[PDB]
Amino acid sequence: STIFSPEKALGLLLSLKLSKWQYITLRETTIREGSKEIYPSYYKVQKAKLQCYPPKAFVAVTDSSAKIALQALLDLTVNRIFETIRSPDAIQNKQLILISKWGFDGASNQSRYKQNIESGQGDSSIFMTSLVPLKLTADGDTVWVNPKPCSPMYCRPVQFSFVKETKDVVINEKTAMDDEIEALVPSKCQGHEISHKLMMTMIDGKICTYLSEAACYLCLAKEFGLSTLHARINVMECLLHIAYRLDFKKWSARGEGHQELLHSRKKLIQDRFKDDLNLLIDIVKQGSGTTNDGNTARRFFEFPDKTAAITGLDEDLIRRFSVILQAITSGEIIDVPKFKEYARTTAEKYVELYDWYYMSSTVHKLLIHGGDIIAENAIVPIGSLSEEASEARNKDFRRFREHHSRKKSRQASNEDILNMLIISSDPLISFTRPKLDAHKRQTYFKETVELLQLQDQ
């Protein structure tokens, strides 16, 4: 009776970032011109939103943290997965196997630059634990399978607190998860009974050394959890470091008078980013040396034509690295053979231009082993997704503050972001969301969509 389902409307809502009253006015104004099979009522959309939420008795929103009980979240997901299977009349109901993925990561944030003058409340540092469902197995066969195993569209939020990622809080979160994992592991839906097998694979290198108290093969033709956030930042930094040394073109600035003009070049480029782009590109807040958020790296690659004029780097190289990071962070399906050729050539262009600066471990793992990592669905979006939430609460806090107190508006923000994270990671809602945002449509390059083989023009 309506072109857009209430759930499909909710998709269009997220894909466009439309407000409640923009959608109501969009509806009314589109009716008054003679067509009502298009959009449902917002009453129907609000109900579709409510259907994504888990029960209110399992959701803990403080002025600090936010937590869902892992039992409640898995059961919620199972139900919404069944509503996307073509004919959920499966034969094995004695046992279904839902294979799921989990992990955690942390991101930082800065609201312009405001020291001794705070623009609101919030630690500007978020720590999020997430879960992703992978395969639905009955007697050894695939019944339903995740179409985007590394997209944030299936990155369910479990518990995010606005705390810095300590070695302790990592171990604290592992045992806090392992216990609620090791304790309860059943589920029920639509007559079938579903057990859960969880794998902690959304983990980077530093977390692994924590949990244990503690190499290429020489790189054959004839590897770890790659964070989208970590890839985007450590490549910007690698490109910046090359830019500072363009005067002498040597990896080590240890030589006679090289350090003298590296700092000279670095200050020229730092100033160029501030007045040409309003970017604090390498400005340090004494937190071991590089307080560059994912926001800073995102804007460093947003305009390859301009970053090259600022840094003195080659535009071809910069655009190549940006297109790659876009494909990674989209969460969409990447044409692995088409990607490997693009990565293999980007590497060739690197040594063509800057063979003197050795490739960072992150750049090596990206360009040289990135094709395989994509192919084995081993890319971790908790990082970038955790940051995008932080940017979105500080936005919500500045909106709620105008009619609520600080301690109350700070929780109304944690309440709303948990919801926004649930709708966006909902299997039935994500089942009909556009392959690329209005944001992704505007920003992604010609080469990027070509790598994603997207017919979502």
Q: Treating both helix axes as pointing N-terminal to C-terminal, what angle do 406-424 and 382-400 enclose, rounded to 10 degrees?
A: 140
Contact region with a second copy (CB under 8 A), list: 3-11, 75-83, 326-334, 375-383: 3-11
Q: Interface with Zn ion includes 360 (CB under 5 A)?
A: no
365 is in an annotated binding site: yes
Best CA proximity match to 322, nearest among 307, 352, 302, 342: 302
Pick the binder of a second copy from 197, 249, 250, 439 (CB under 8 A).
439
Question: Which CB sits closer to a second copy, 27 or 156?
Answer: 27
Q: Interface with a second copy includes 26 (CB under 8 A)?
A: yes
Shortest gap between Cβ of 85 and a second copy (angstroms)? 21
106 is in an annotated binding site: yes
The site for Na ion (CB under 5 A) is made up of 437, 439
* Burial tier of 264 (Cβ tally within 10 Å: 0-12, 13-18, 19+): exposed
Residues 262-321 that bind a second copy (CB under 8 A): 275-278, 299, 302-303, 306
Q: Interface with a second copy includes 415 (CB under 8 A)?
A: no
Q: Interface with Zn ion includes 219 (CB under 5 A)?
A: yes
AA identity, residue 440: K
- Radius of gyration of the chain measured on its C-alpha atoms: 23
Beta bridge partners of 98: 136, 196
What backbone phi and psi angles, to 5 degrees, belong to 334? -105, 130
258 is in an annotated binding site: no
Q: Interface with Zn ion includes 218 (CB under 5 A)?
A: no
User: Token pair of 454, please?
Assistant: 């997207």
Best CA proximity match to 151, nearest among 293, 300, 334, 322: 334
Helix H segments across 355-426? Answer: 361-367, 370-375, 382-400, 406-424
For the CA atoms of 435, 102, 386, 81, what is the dihedral angle to 10 degrees?
A: 40
Q: By beta-carbon distance, which residue lies closest to Na ion?
A: 439
Pick the binder of a second copy from 1, 87, 142, 457 (CB under 8 A).
457
**What are the Cα distances from residue 220, in Å, to 217, 289, 373?**
7, 35, 15
Question: Coil, helix or strand for 357?
Answer: coil
The item of Zn ion, Na ion, a second copy, none sharing an interface with residue 195, based on CB under 5 to 8 Å by kind, is none
Question: Which CB sits closer to a second copy, 152 or 157?
Answer: 152
391 is in an annotated binding site: yes
The footprint of a second copy (CB under 8 A) covers 3-4, 8, 11-12, 15-22, 24-26, 28-30, 32-35, 37-38, 112, 119, 275-278, 299, 302-303, 306, 401-406, 434, 437-439, 441-442, 456-457
Specify binding-site residues for Ca(2+): 105-106, 204, 391
The footprint of Zn ion (CB under 5 A) covers 216, 219, 368
